[PDB]
């Protein structure tokens, strides 16, 4: 009484595992996935296999790639469009192959980070006058949008009552939950995350009217920081 996943159904679960390993999602549905892989890929898609697929798609892979991140039978049509819609049916991310990027667009967070010491500073920071070196903001009044460019992604940015789109050279995706901005994590002899990313806040709706950012305001050399809050809505 084992369920049989069709080609399409299993691909969604295959992507769902990748999204969980990337840490963009916290849950996964893998019922029937292993048989789907043995049948349609001719291999065991265990954790080592998936880690190699992720490493290759985002970093080491070169040439055309297929829908299952490999570089009659399915998955023999290798793309050159630069991205895959990693789409589980429960969540989705538009993810760009490392070959489509002008070099490496990631940072190795396994290396010891330059430690940042606490320092007194305003609990509120204005969106129009950000002194924090980890964040840069652009307001587009014409289209009622705010873009926050996060330049030190290792410093957590927590969203409160926000509905945003994350743009990066790694993946683009939407976030509708409170808490620290989730970022793709790629294992390649260590943990890697995007080197920068953009938070896009649309204010042309009402649901961002209370959107607020909480982060460490990093200032300079020796690095210093203090808790601050940036109201967007």
């Amino acid at each position, epitope marked *: 009484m084992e369920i049989i996943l*069709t080609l399409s159904q299993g691909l969604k679960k295959y992507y769902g595992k990748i999204l969980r390993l990337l840490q963009l999602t916290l849950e996964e549905d893998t019922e029937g996935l292993l048989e789907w892989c043995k*049948r349609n*890929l*001719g291999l065991d898609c265990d954790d080592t296999f998936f880690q190699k697929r992720i490493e290759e798609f985002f970093i080491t892979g070169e040439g055309h790639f297929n829908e299952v991140l490999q570089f*009659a*039978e399915p998955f023999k049509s290798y793309f050159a469009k630069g991205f895959l819609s990693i789409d589980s049916g429960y969540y989705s991310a538009k993810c760009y192959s490392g070959t489509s990027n002008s070099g490496l667009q990631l940072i190795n967070i396994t290396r010891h980070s330059t430690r940042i010491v606490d320092t007194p500073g305003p609990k509120i920071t204005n969106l129009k006058t950000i002194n924090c070196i980890n964040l840069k903001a652009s307001i587009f009044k014409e289209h009622r949008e705010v873009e926050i460019n996060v330049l030190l992604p290792q410093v957590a940015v927590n969203l409160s009552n926000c509905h945003v789109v994350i743009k990066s050279h790694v993946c683009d995706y939407s976030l509708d939950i409170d808490g620290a901005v989730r970022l793709p994590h790629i294992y390649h002899e260590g943990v890697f995350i995007p080197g920068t990313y953009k938070i896009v806040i649309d204010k042309k709706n009402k649901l961002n009217d209370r959107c607020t950012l909480f982060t460490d305001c990093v200032i300079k050399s020796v690095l210093r920081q203090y808790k601050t809050e940036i109201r967007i809505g």
Partner: antibody
Amino acid sequence: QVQLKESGPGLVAPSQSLSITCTVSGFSLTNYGIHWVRQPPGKGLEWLGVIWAGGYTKYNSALMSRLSMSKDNSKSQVFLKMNSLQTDDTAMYYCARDEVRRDYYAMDYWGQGTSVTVSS
Amino acid sequence: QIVLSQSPAILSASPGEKVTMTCWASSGVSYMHWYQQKPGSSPKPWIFATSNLASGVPARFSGSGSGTSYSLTISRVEAEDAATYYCQQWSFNPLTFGAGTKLELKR
């Protein structure tokens, strides 16, 4: 054209094992799985198992203790072996090509079948 | 296992009549295959995935259904349609077949 042809022993004793071969042409076993299905006399069809293009197998859990499958890509042949034979293993044995579509699997080409009687 | 119960066991039809045979599954499945078998021959793929006619199958055949109830319909039966028709599910292991509906032609 796509072709499948079973070959086996018409008679096997209950103490022996049953070995049947499926020889294919018009396609490569590197690209297509092969199913085995049997039909006891005047009775309905029963799926036995499959060997996929990549070599992994899946058997009917009601008989996986007695059934095994393998293949020889270079010979375009797939093999069925069944042991601990019982009288009710008497049946016509068919191989059939596995087909993959986006939203279903299918068994799109069938052999003519080979007759196996299990008797001493 | 998913048990497929085909009803009726024998369909008797005169040429030109419309007939429908049913395949009831013991639990819901996502699609149903159908095969035609004539005596002395192997099962022939007839309908793929509930409603898709296999190559060469006459347009008088159709398939429909969902969940636990699927059907095969012949809009106007012909003498050559005399045969046994089997349904088959591919939603759960092990793959299972119905025991067949035998279409008998009257004359």
